[PDB]
Amino acid sequence: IRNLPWVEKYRPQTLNDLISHQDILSTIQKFINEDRLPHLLLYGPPGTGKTSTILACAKQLYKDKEFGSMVLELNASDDRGIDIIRGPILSFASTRTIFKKGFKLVILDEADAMTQDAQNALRRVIEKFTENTRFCLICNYLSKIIPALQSRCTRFRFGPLTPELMVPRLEHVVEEEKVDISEDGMKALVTLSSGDMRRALNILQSTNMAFGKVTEETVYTCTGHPLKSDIANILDWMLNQDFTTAYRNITELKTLKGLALHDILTEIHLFVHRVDFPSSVRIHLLTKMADIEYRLSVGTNEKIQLSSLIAAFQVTRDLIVAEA
Amino acid sequence: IEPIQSRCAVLRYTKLTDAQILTRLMNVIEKERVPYTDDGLEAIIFTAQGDMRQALNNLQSTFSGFGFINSENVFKVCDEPHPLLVKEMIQHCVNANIDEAYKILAHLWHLGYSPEDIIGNIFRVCKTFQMAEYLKLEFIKEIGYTHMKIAEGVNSLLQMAGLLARLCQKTMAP
Amino acid sequence: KPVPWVEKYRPKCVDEVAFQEEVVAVLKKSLEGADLPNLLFYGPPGTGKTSTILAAARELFGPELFRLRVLELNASDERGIQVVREKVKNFAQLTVSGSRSDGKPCPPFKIVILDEADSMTSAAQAALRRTMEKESKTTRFCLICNYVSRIIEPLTSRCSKFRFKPLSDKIQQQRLLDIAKKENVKISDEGIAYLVKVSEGDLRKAITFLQSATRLTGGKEITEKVITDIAGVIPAEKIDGVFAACQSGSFDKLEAVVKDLIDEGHAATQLVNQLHDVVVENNLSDKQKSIITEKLAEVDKCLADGADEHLQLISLCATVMQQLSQNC
Amino acid sequence: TEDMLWTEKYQPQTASELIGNELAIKKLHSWLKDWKRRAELEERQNLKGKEEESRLCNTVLITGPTGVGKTAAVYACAQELGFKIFEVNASSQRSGRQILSQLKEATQSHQVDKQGVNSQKPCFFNSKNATSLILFEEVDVIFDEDAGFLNAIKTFMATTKRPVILTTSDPTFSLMFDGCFEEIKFSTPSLLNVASYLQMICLTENFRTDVKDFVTLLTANTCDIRKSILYLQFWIRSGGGVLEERPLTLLPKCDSGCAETLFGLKNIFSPSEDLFSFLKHKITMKEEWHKFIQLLTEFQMRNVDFLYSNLEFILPLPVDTIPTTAGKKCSALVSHCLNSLSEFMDNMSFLDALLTDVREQNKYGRNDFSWTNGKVTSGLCDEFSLESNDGWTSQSSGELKAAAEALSFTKCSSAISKALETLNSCKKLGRDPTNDLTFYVSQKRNNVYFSQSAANLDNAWKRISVIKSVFSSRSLLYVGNRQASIIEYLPTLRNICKTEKLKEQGKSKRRFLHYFEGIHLDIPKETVNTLAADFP
Amino acid sequence: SLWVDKYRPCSLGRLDYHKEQAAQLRNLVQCGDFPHLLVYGPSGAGKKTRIMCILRELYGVGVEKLRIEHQTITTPSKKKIEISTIASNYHLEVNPSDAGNSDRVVIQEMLKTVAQSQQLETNSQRDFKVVLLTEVDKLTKDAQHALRRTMEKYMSTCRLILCCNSTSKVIPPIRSRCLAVRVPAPSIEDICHVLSTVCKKEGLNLPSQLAHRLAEKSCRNLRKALLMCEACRVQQYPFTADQEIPETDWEVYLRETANAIVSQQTPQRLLEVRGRLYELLTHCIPPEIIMKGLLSELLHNCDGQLKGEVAQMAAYYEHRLQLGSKAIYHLEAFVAKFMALYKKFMED
Amino acid sequence: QRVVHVQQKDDGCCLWHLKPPSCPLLTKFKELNTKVIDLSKCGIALGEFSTLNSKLKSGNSAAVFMRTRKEFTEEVRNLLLEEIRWSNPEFSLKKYFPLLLKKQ
Ligand SMILES: Nc1ncnc2c1ncn2[C@@H]1O[C@H](COP(=O)(O)OP(=O)(O)OP(O)(O)=S)[C@@H](O)[C@H]1O
Ligand SMILES: Nc1ncnc2c1ncn2[C@@H]1O[C@H](COP(=O)(O)OP(=O)(O)OP(O)(O)=S)[C@@H](O)[C@H]1O
Ligand SMILES: Nc1ncnc2c1ncn2[C@@H]1O[C@H](COP(=O)(O)OP(=O)(O)OP(O)(O)=S)[C@@H](O)[C@H]1O
Ligand SMILES: Nc1ncnc2c1ncn2[C@@H]1O[C@H](COP(=O)(O)OP(=O)(O)O)[C@@H](O)[C@H]1O
Ligand SMILES: [Mg+2]
Ligand SMILES: [Mg+2]
Ligand SMILES: [Mg+2]
C-alpha cells in the first residue's frame, strides 16, 4: 500500500510548528508581515529546519497556483558552475510575471556546493535585482560561501536541537504513532541523533519496523553503532590485560562486530573524559589517539595502528598502577 | 593569466586595519544616532576580519534586530563562537586545565559550530592572546597542524581534543 | 578471451555460497518476494560478498539482463562523490526493457553495487543519502564494505545489514584443491596449505596467486618458492636475521642485514608487517611491545607517505635494537 | 596632456632601439631584408618584361617569453624595411574560411596603393613600394570558433608569395606544428640591460632612480619588459615612492622604493617606516605584530617565503660577501647561536611539511629542479574550471603560516641577539668568534634589496639545459629511466668527457676526439665541452 | 651506443642470470592470458631489460623499432600539459609522475587514447597493447586510484607493466591486481660474469680481480658496473689488476659535504653546507639520494650509540622532506640538528 | 522495504555476551558539570581582540603629493648619464638616450 516516512509526515507546514528556534522564527515572521523580507542565509547542520522554514515562508507569501511560477527552487549539487546562475536563475530574476505583481523568491538549497565563480555571479544577480526577487540560500557550512555572497544576506544559524526541547515532540510523535519505547530508547535516540530531527525520526521509524520494540539494544543493533558494553570491554582489555591478550581479544571483537578502528577511537575518546583519569594520563591518551586517528586517514595497516592504540594505554597502565 | 597581467599595472589591496574600520564605523554611528558601547564596537570589529562591507552589514543587522550595540546583541546577530569562551578555553590550556578546556570545547561542539569555525576562532583569539612568545609559538604551531588535519579531511572532536591536549602538553613540557 | 579464475569460478546461483547461512536465507526470501531491499554486506575481504550479491542479481534477472540492469561502482573514486552521483543519476534516469523466456517478469527497479563503501567520508555519505532517498522505488543499492561502523547512521538505518564470516583454512584448502584438480595443475596438499596460510584467509588472493603460479610455472609443479615470491612475502630466515641483528647490538651488521633485504627486492611495508606479527606474538615485555609497536605504526605511516625504505627500516631497526638491548 | 601608454609612446621604431635578443633581431631583419630584395627584384623583372641556394623560406616563426619584444621587433623591422603588416590576432574571429577568403589576396596580389600613408599597418577583422607581410599573432591561441585555422595557415605555408611571420609564447608549439619555417628563439634579456633601459626612460621623465630598485622589480616580474614599463608609468606618474636624497658621484633627489610599492608593502607600512629597519628592530607593539603578520601574509599568497629567502640580511648576524672561562664563553655563544638557528630551521621545515600551503605546489609539473616537467599552457577554451575548491582554507592558511613564521623568526632573532650582546666580553678577551658567526652571501643575492629565491636559478636553468641536450641525442633518447639516467649515465659521460679532454690536451691522437663518433654518440660538441669542464 | 645500450639482451634466452625467472617469464606469455605486471626491485638489477625481453617475446621484432611522441592533455582546471612518450607499433612507454599532482590526468586520458588506438589498429598479432608505466612508486594516491580504475576499465584492450623500485608507496588495491615480478640485484659473481661476457665481445681481456673490484664497488648495480667498466676502458687500453676505478663526481661531492658538516659546527659552516646542498639540488640530484649518501658518510664518522639517534633523525627529516614541497628546508633542518647533536656529543 | 540486521552469532567465541567491567576505574565515572560562564556578564574592552588604541594618529597621513618635477638641466642630465654608465659599464647609453629624448 503506502508507508510514507515519518520525516515527511511530521513536517512543520506552518512556522509555528518549529520547536527549537524561536527568536529567529519571530524575527522571520516579523520580516514577513511588515513586508521587509531580506535575502536570507539559513545555515546549519542537517535536520534543523531550514527548508521547512523557507517552505512555510513561501506558503505564507505565495499561493498554490502561483507556487510554480513565482518561487524557483534549485539544488546547486545537480549542476554547479555559472551555467545555472547565468541561465535559469538570471532569467527568473530579470523577468516579470504578466499579471502577478510583487516579488519573486529563489530557494537555492545546498548553496555550499556552488563554485567560487558561480557565487561571484550569483552575488551580482542578487545586487542587480533586489526589488524584483529575494534570495534564500540554505547551506550547511558557511565556510564554503564567499563573504561577498554572505554579506548580501542576513545569516541565520539553525543550531542542533537541544534534547530538552527535542524530547517533547519525540514523545508527541511516539504517542501519535503508538510505539512501545522505553526511556533508554529515547536516550539512545537523542544521543545518536545529535540535534537532527530527520535523523531522529528516521532512526525511530526504522527501528520500529525492524523490531517493533525500540529499546537501547534495538536502536544500537538497528543503526549499526558500537555498543557501550563493547567499548567498555575494550577499555577493560587495554586497562587490565597484557599486550597479546588485549590484541587478540580486540581483533576478535572487531572481526565479530564489523568494527573499524576510527569508530573505536571515536567512542574511546568519549570514554576517556568520563573515566576518572589523571590529567597527565588524559593528555597523553588524547594526544596518542589523535595521532592514531590521523594515521588511519592515509592508507595504513589497521593491525599496526590497533597495536599502537593498545600501546597508548599500556604506556600509562603501569604508571597508573604504580601511582595508586 | 600572465599575458593579461603583463599588460596591466597590478595594485595590491591589503586588509583594512581595525582603526580604519573603527573610524568609518563611528562615522556611520554619528550619522545615524545609533546608541552603542565600546564592547559592541569591539565585537563588530572582531566579527569583520578586515571586511568593511561585513562590518557595515553587521552594524545594520544589529540595529535592525535590537537597536543597541553590545556584544550580546552583536554575537546574537552574527552567531559565531564567542571570543570570551575561546579566551577562557585558551586560558585553561595555558594553566594545563584539560578538563575545563574540554568542557568549553564540548559546549562549542554541542552548540553545532563547524570544526573550521572553531579552529579559526581559536587562531584569531590566540593571535591576540596575552602569553609568552615561545608559548604562543608552540600554540600557533599546534593550531596550524590541527588546521592542516581539518583541511585534509580528518575533522572530529577527537582531533580538537588532541589539539587541546597538545596545548596543555606545551605548558607542562619545557 | 580466457577469464580469471576468480570471475570464472564464483557461484552462479544463491545457496551455492558456502559457510553463509542467514545471509543466504534472507536473500532467498527476498528472491521469493522478488523485492530486494537496500543491502549492506560487511566482512573480511575475499569472503563471498560480491559473489552473493552477483548471484542474487543473476538469479533475480536473466543471464543476458544481469550485466545490463546492475552497475558496479567503486566508492573510492578520487574525484569526490559528485562524479559517482552523476553516474547513479544517469543510470537511474536511463531505462532499459527486460523480458525473460523462463516465464518470470523482471523487477521494475535496478541494482547499484557500491563497493568499498566504507572509504567514503561522512560528507560524501550524507550526499549519497539524498540520492538513495530520492530514487528509492526505482533503484536499490547494495553497499559492500568491511566495517559497518564506517557507514553513517542515516545510511545504516535504512539498509539491511549482513555480516560475512571467513571460511576456515580446511574449507579454503578444499576449494583450492578442487580448483587445481579442475584446471589440471600438479600441486600437493602442502603447497595448497602454504598458499592458504600466505593469503591469510583471503580466498580471492589465494585463487589469484594459484592462477598466477600456474601461468608462471609453465606446467610444472607448484613449489613453495614460487608461491613465496609471487605473494611478496619475505621468508622467515630474513626475519630471524633481522631480529638476531637487533639483539646483537651492532649497528653495522644491522645496516648489512637491512641493505641485504633492500637488495633482494623485498618491500619495507611487508617487512613491517612481518616484524609486527613477530613482535605482538612473542615473550617480550609490555613496555618493549608498546614502544616497538608505536614505532612500527609510525614507520608504516611514513612509508605510506612515500618515504625511502632504507632510512625508515634503519630507524625502526635501531629502535627495536635499543628496546631489545635495554634488558642487557 | 598625454593620451598614450608608455609602451606605445616609447615603442621602438628601429631594430637598433630594441633591448637584447640581438641575434634573433639580426636573423629576422636579414630574413625580411631578403624578402624585400626579392620583392624589389620582382618589380624590376616586371619593369623589364613590361631556390635551394637562396633557401629563403616563406615563413619565419618567432617564440619566446611574454613581453620580451617579439611583436615590437616585427613591427620595427617591417617599418624600417617598408613592409605593410596585415595582423591576425586572437582578438578577432579567425576561422579558416574567413582568414583564407579575406587575406590570401594580400599575399597573392599586388598592393593597389603602393605609395602614400600605406606604411601604416592595419589589422584584420570580420564581425616607395610597400610589400605585404602577414603577421599571425599568438598562433598558440586556438578556439573552437577558429575551426580549420591550422589547415588555413598550412594553406598559407603552401600558396603564399609574400612573407608570413608567426608570433607565439608557447615553447612547444614548434613541435606539434608540421611545416617548413625558419625558427627564431627570443631568450629572456639580461637584468642590467633592461634596468638601464628603464633608467633611461625614467631619466627622460626627469627622474633619478637607482639600479638596484629596478633590478629588484625586474627580477620580481621575471624581465617582462612591457609589465615593468607599465608599472613604471603608473609609479612615476603618481609621484614616486619616497623622498630620499642620495648623493653619489660614480643635484636632485633619488627615488628608491619602487619594489616595495610593487608588492604592496606600502599599503601596510607607514612612509617613515622601512622594511629592513622594521625587521631588524625588536617588535613589541600589537600594531607592529599586525603589520608583520600582514606583510608575511602578503608574501605567502605568492607562495614565497620572505624571511628564509633573505635570511642572512634580516638576521642580526654579520654578513660578508664571498671573494677555561674564556674558552667556555667563546664556545657557548656559538653553541647557543647554532641551537637557535637549528630551532628556526626545524620550525621552517615544520611549516613547509606539516602546514597547508594556500597554493597547491607541484600541481601541473613536479617539484622544482626537474627537466622532466614539460610545458604548462594556459586555457584555450571558454569553459570554467568546475571543480571543488576550498576558499576558507586558502584564506586562513596564509595567516596561519605567516603568524607561525613571524613567531619562529622573532624567537630565533631574540635568541641570537641575547646570545650576541655577550660577544663584547669575548672581544675584550682577545678572541674573535665573529669569523664563525658570519654569513657568506653570493653577489646575486647581494645586489638586490630582497630576494624571492635563495638559489641560483640561472645555474639551475643552465644545468637543466645541458641535461636536456645530453639526453636528446638519438642514442640516449630511448633510455627508459630518467633520474637513474642523470645518476648513472650522466656522471660516466662527464668522466668520459673529462678523460677525452685530458687526452686532447696531452697532444694524443685525434681519433680519440672521435670516440663519441666511434660509438656513434650524437652529443653536440658544445655539450661535450660543457661536460668535460668540471662538476661544480 | 654504450655496452649498457648495445649489448643489452633482447631475447629471454639471452639473459645470463635469473635463468629460472627468465624461463618463468617465457612461459608467462605462452598461455595468452598475459596480465598486468608489477616489476620491482633495486635500481639497475635488470628490470627494464626483462621488460624489453618480454615485449620482444610477446610481439614481433618491431617493438625494437622505437619512436618518441608528444601529447598535450587538458587538465580539469582547463590547463594544458605536454608530456613525452616512448612508443612503437605495439607498445607504449610513459613516466606519468612527470605531471606532478596532475599525473592522474595523464594516467587517464593517455590510456584511454591507447585503448582507442587498439580499437582502431588491427594486425591479428595480439589482442592487447602493453603500456609501460615507469616510476609507479612516485604516483600520488589519487593517481593510483585513477590507475586502479583505468586498469579495471581497459583491461581487455590494453595491458599494463608497472616498473617501480618500491612497492611500499604502491597502494594495496594496485598490488592485488598485477602479477608481482621481484627482480633482485645480481650477485658479485653474476656481475663479474656479465662484465667478462660484455668485455669479450670488444676483443678485450679484463682480469677477474678488476671485475671483482668493479662488482664490489658498484653495490650490486649491473648498469653502474658496466658503465664503470666503460670508463675504465676509456681510461686505459690494457686492464691492469690495480686499475683505478673512477668514483662518481656527485658522490665525492657529497663526501666532501659530509666532512664539511663533521669538521666544523658553526652557523657559517651551516650556510656553506646550505650552498653545497643548493648546488647539488640544481643538478637535479633527488633529495632522497642526497639524504642517503649524507647519512651514510655521517654514520661513517659517528660513534656507536650516536648512530641510532642520527639514523632516526635522518629518517624523520626524510619523511618531512617527502611531505614538504621545498625539500631544501628539511635537508638543512637535518644538517643543523645533526650539527647541534654532534657539538653536544663532543662537549662531554 | 523493511530493514534488518543479521549477525551470525557464534556462542563459542564468548565475545557476544559481554558484561560491564568490574574494575574501579570503569565503575566510578567522573562527572563533568557542563557549567560555563555567561557570555554577556564579563564584557569586552577596546583593543582586547584587535590592535585598536584609544589614541588615533592625525596629520601623519593623507599627504597629497602636488609634486612639480622640474625639468632636468643639461649638465645634471649628463652627470646622471655618466652615473648610470659607471653603474653599467657594458651598456650603450650614448646610442639610446638621445633617441629616447627624441621619443619624448
Ligand atoms: N524545528 C523542527 N521542528 C519540527 N520538526 C523538524 C524541525 N526541523 C526539522 N524537523 C523535521 O525534519 C524533517 C526534515 O527537516 P529539513 O528542514 O527538511 O532538514 P533541512 O533543514 O533542510 O537540513 P538540510 O541541510 O537541508 S539536509 C522535517 O520534515 C521535520 O519532520
Ligand atoms: N562462502 C563462499 N562461497 C563460495 N565462494 C566463496 C565464498 N567465499 C569466498 N568465495 C570465493 O572467493 C572469491 C572471492 O570472493 P568475492 O565474493 O568475489 O570477492 P569478495 O568476497 O567481495 O572480496 P572483496 O571484493 O575484495 S571485499 C570468489 O572466487 C568466490 O567464489
Ligand atoms: N626589447 C624591447 N625593447 C623595447 N621595448 C620593448 C621591448 N620588449 C617589449 N617592449 C615594449 O613592450 C610593448 C609590448 O611588447 P610586445 O612586443 O607586444 O611583447 P610580445 O613579445 O609580443 O609578447 P606577447 O605578445 O605579450 S606574448 C612594446 O610595444 C614596447 O613598448
Ligand atoms: N641478463 C643480462 N645479461 C647481460 N646484460 C644485462 C642483463 N641484464 C641487464 N643487463 C644490462 O644491464 C643494464 C640493466 O639496466 P636496466 O635494467 O635498464 O636498469 P633498471 O633495472 O633500473 O631499469 C642494461 O643496460 C643491460 O645492458
Ligand atoms: Mg532540505
Ligand atoms: Mg568485491
Ligand atoms: Mg605581441
Helix (H) or strand (E) holding E260: helix E249-263
* Residues A202, C154: C-beta atoms closer than 8 Å: yes
Name residue D78's amino acid: A
Å between A218 CA and nearest CA of chain E:
36
- CA–centroid distance, D362 to ligand 5, in Å, is 39
- For residue E181, the chain C residue with the least C-alpha distance is C230
Q: Helices A302-323 and A228-240: crossing angle, nearest 10°? A: 60
- Cell 642517503 sits on residue: E292
Backbone angles phi, psi at E159, to 5 degrees: -120, 155
**Which pairs with CB-CB distance under 8 Å and at least 24 residues apart come from D455-460?**
D455/E278, D455/E281, D455/E282, D455/E328, D456/E278, D456/E279, D456/E282, D459/E279, D459/E282, D460/D369, D460/E282
- The answer to whether C303 and E172 are in contact (CB under 8 A) is no
Ramachandran class of D12: left when φ > 0, alpha when ψ lies in -120 to 50, beta otherwise: beta
Handedness of CA A27, A29, A31, A33 (dihedral sign): negative
- The answer to whether D391 and A144 are in contact (CB under 8 A) is yes
Q: CATH code for E249-347?
A: 1.20.272.10
Residues on chain A touching E167 (C-beta within 8 angstroms): none
Question: Residue B170, SS3?
Answer: helix
Report the alpha-carbon distance of residue A143 to residue B114 in Å, rounded. 9
**What resolution in angstroms, rounded to 1 decimal?**
3.0
Helix (H) or strand (E) holding E263: helix E249-263
Report the alpha-carbon distance of residue D356 to residue A11 in Å, rounded. 43
- CA–centroid distance, D476 to ligand 4, in Å, is 15
Report the alpha-carbon distance of residue B48 to residue B59 in Å, rounded. 10
* Residues B162, A45: C-beta atoms closer than 8 Å: no
Report the alpha-carbon distance of residue E151 to residue A86 in Å, rounded. 39
Task: Establish whether residue A44 lines the binding site of ligand 1, counting it when its CB lies within 6 angstroms of any ligand atom.
Answer: no
Report the alpha-carbon distance of residue D460 to residue D466 in Å, rounded. 10
| A226-316 and A3-161 share a CATH fold | no
Q: Residue D244 gets which letter from DSSP?
A: B
Backbone angles phi, psi at A248, to 5 degrees: -65, -45
Domain with B161, as residue range(s), is 81-172
Residue B59, domain CATH: 1.10.8.60
Ligand nearest to the Cα of F103, by number: 3
Question: Residue A72, SS3?
Answer: strand
- CA–centroid distance, D167 to ligand 7, in Å, is 7
Backbone angles phi, psi at D192, to 5 degrees: -75, -35
User: Would you identify the CATH topology of the domain A226-316?
Assistant: Zinc Finger, Delta Prime; domain 3 (1.20.272)
Cα-based torsion angle of the residue sequence A42, A48, A50, A53 in order, rounded to the nearest 10 degrees: -130
How many beta carbons lie within 10 A of that of residue D142, not counting itself? 15
CA-wise closest residue to C80 among E311, D528, A77, D168: A77
Report the alpha-carbon distance of residue C319 to residue C272 in Å, rounded. 13
- Same-domain pairing of B65 and B96: no
- The answer to whether D347 and D407 are in contact (CB under 8 A) is no
Question: Residue A35, SS3?
Answer: coil
Backbone angles phi, psi at B23, to 5 degrees: -65, -45
Cell of C286: 609490555
Report the alpha-carbon distance of residue D395 to residue D401 in Å, rounded. 11
Task: Establish whether residue A12 lines the binding site of ligand 1, counting it when its CB lies within 6 angstroms of any ligand atom.
Answer: yes
What class has domain A3-161? Answer: alpha beta
Task: Establish whether residue C13 lines the binding site of ligand 2, counting it when its CB lies within 6 angstroms of any ligand atom.
Answer: no
Which residues lie across from A136 on neighbouring strands? A40, A107
Cell of A223: 543503526
Ramachandran class of A95: left when φ > 0, alpha when ψ lies in -120 to 50, beta otherwise: beta
- Cell 592458504 sits on residue: C196
With a CB cutoff of 8 Å and minimum separation 6, the contacts of D98 are: D126
Task: Establish whether residue D10 lines the binding site of ligand 3, counting it when its CB lies within 6 angstroms of any ligand atom.
Answer: yes
Report the alpha-carbon distance of residue C17 to residue C50 in Å, rounded. 11
**Who among E102, E228, E282 is closest to D459 (CB)?**
E282
- For residue F26, the chain A residue with the least C-alpha distance is A275
- The answer to whether E273 and E261 are in contact (CB under 8 A) is yes
CA-wise closest residue to E291 among E307, E310, E265, E264: E310
Question: Residue B36, SS3?
Answer: strand
- Same-domain pairing of B31 and B95: no
Report the alpha-carbon distance of residue E118 to residue E59 in Å, rounded. 14
Counting CB pairs under 8 A, whether chains F and B reach 3 or more, is yes
Report the alpha-carbon distance of residue C256 to residue C242 in Å, rounded. 10
- The answer to whether E161 and E131 are in contact (CB under 8 A) is yes
Q: In whole angstroms, how large is the CA radius of gyration of chain A? A: 25
Half-sphere exposure of D423 (CA within 13 A, CB side): 20
How many beta carbons lie within 10 A of that of residue B74, not counting itself? 28
Ligand nearest to the Cα of A7, by number: 1
With a CB cutoff of 8 Å and minimum separation 6, the contacts of E33 are: C2, C4, C215
Report the alpha-carbon distance of residue E348 to residue A259 in Å, rounded. 52
B111 burial type by CB count under 10 A (0-12 exposed, 13-18 middle, 19+ buried): middle
Q: Where are the alpha helices (DSSP H) in D240-285?
A: 258-262, 275-280
Give how far Cα D366 sits from Cα of D373, E92, E283, Å. Answer: 6, 22, 16
Domain boundaries, chain E: 19-182, 249-347
Name residue A223's amino acid: T
Domain boundaries, chain A: 3-161, 162-225, 226-316
Report the alpha-carbon distance of residue D340 to residue D342 in Å, rounded. 5
Nearest-atom index, ligand 2, CA of C146: 27
Report the alpha-carbon distance of residue F69 to residue F49 in Å, rounded. 45
- The answer to whether B96 and B173 are in contact (CB under 8 A) is no
DSSP C99-164: --TTS-PPPSS-EEEEESGGGS-HHHHHHHHHHHHHSTTT-EEEEEES-GGGS-HHHHHHSEEEE-
- For residue F86, the chain D residue with the least C-alpha distance is D250
Cell of A7: 520525516
A103 burial type by CB count under 10 A (0-12 exposed, 13-18 middle, 19+ buried): middle
Helix (H) or strand (E) holding A213: strand A213-214
Ligand nearest to the Cα of E40, by number: 4
DSSP A276-290: ---HHHHHHHHHHHH
Helix (H) or strand (E) holding E181: strand E179-182
Report the alpha-carbon distance of residue D209 to residue A77 in Å, rounded. 55
* Bridge-based pairing state of the strands C39-42 and C160-163: parallel
**Who among C44, C158, C273 is closest to A206 (CB)?**
C158
Suggest the residue from A86, A110, A142, A144 to mutate for an interface test with chain D (most D CBs closer than 10 A). A144
Degrees (nearest 5) of the Cα angle E7, E11, E12? 120
- Across E162-193, b (16+ Cβ under 10 Å) vs e yields bbbbbbbbbbebbbebbbbbbbbbbeeebbbb
E219 burial type by CB count under 10 A (0-12 exposed, 13-18 middle, 19+ buried): middle
* Residues A265, B154: C-beta atoms closer than 8 Å: no
CATH number of this structure's domain A162-225, picked from the four choices 1.20.1440.230, 1.10.8.60, 3.40.50.2000, 1.10.260.40: 1.10.8.60
Report the alpha-carbon distance of residue C295 to residue C83 in Å, rounded. 38
Question: Residue E129, SS3?
Answer: strand
User: Would you identify the CATH topology of the domain E19-182?
Assistant: Rossmann fold (3.40.50)
Report the alpha-carbon distance of residue C136 to residue D248 in Å, rounded. 83
Give how far Cα A283 sits from Cα of A316, B136, D342, Å. Answer: 11, 19, 28
- Same-domain pairing of B62 and B22: yes
- The answer to whether E83 and E50 are in contact (CB under 8 A) is no
CA-wise closest residue to A152 among B57, D518, B128, D12: B57
Name residue C219's amino acid: G
**What helix, strand, coil percent values describe chain F, rounded to 5?**
25, 5, 75
Report the alpha-carbon distance of residue D85 to residue D250 in Å, rounded. 45
**Who among D239, D240, D250 is closest to F87 (CB)?**
D250
DSSP E145-170: HHHHHHHHHSTTTEEEEEEES-SSSS
Handedness of CA E61, E62, E66, E70 (dihedral sign): negative
- Same-domain pairing of B22 and B34: yes
Cell of D403: 603568524
- The answer to whether D357 and D396 are in contact (CB under 8 A) is no
- The answer to whether D169 and B2 are in contact (CB under 8 A) is no
